[PDB]
Design a protein around this ligand. Structure first.
Ligand code: O7W
Ligand code: NI
Length: 149
């Protein structure tokens, strides 16, 4: 077999069960989702309250299940506005035990400029591209268009 097949095995057995975002300054829920936004090869859409743009720090919880073991599960996210990448984020979970369900909590502090850009201009014009990796092995690339409501 080969690295490409190993990456497909991981993807086959992976799923995102639920996700939430909280305002880190209060611990209050801002948004909750239950779509598996890890699914590649299609474009997804997420509708999120515009208050998220005005938060200096957002705590994100991603709950996921993995059939396969991963030595170093990590994410790369890029935020594109009208085709231009305005921000890049790197997150690391680490070792994933086979046949496990896990909650990954990450603090996200977006660029201060994003807190003043009008939601009316951003809405429907932002794509978050996420690349799921096991160390340097690309498992999936997903794309989600954001709407700020
Ligand atoms: C790994 C699984 C997974 C997949 C997809 C998603 C994508 N989703 C649904 C969200 O990220 C929701 C929260 C949200 N909406 N806009 C933002 C930041 C905007 C922003 C930050 N810097 C900027 C600079 C300029 C303009 C806008 C911005 O964050 C989350 C998790
Ligand atoms: Ni082989």
């Amino acid at each position: 077999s080969a690295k490409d097949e190993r990456a497909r095995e991981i993807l086959r057995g992976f799923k995102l069960n639920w996700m939430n975002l909280r305002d880190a300054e209060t611990g209050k829920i801002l948004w909750q989702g239950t779509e598996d936004l890890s699914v590649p090869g299609v474009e997804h859409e997420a509708r999120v309250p515009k208050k998220i743009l005005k938060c200096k720090a957002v705590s994100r919880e991603l709950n996921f299940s993995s059939t396969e073991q991963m030595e170093k599960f990590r994410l790369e996210q890029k935020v594109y506005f009208k085709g231009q990448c305005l921000e890049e984020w790197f997150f690391e979970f680490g070792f994933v035990i086979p046949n496990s369900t896990n909650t990954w909590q990450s603090l996200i502090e977006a660029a201060p400029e994003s807190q003043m850009m009008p939601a009316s201009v951003l809405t429907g014009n932002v794509i978050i591209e996420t690349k799921f990796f096991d160390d340097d092995l690309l498992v999936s690339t997903s794309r989600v268009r954001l709407f700020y409501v």
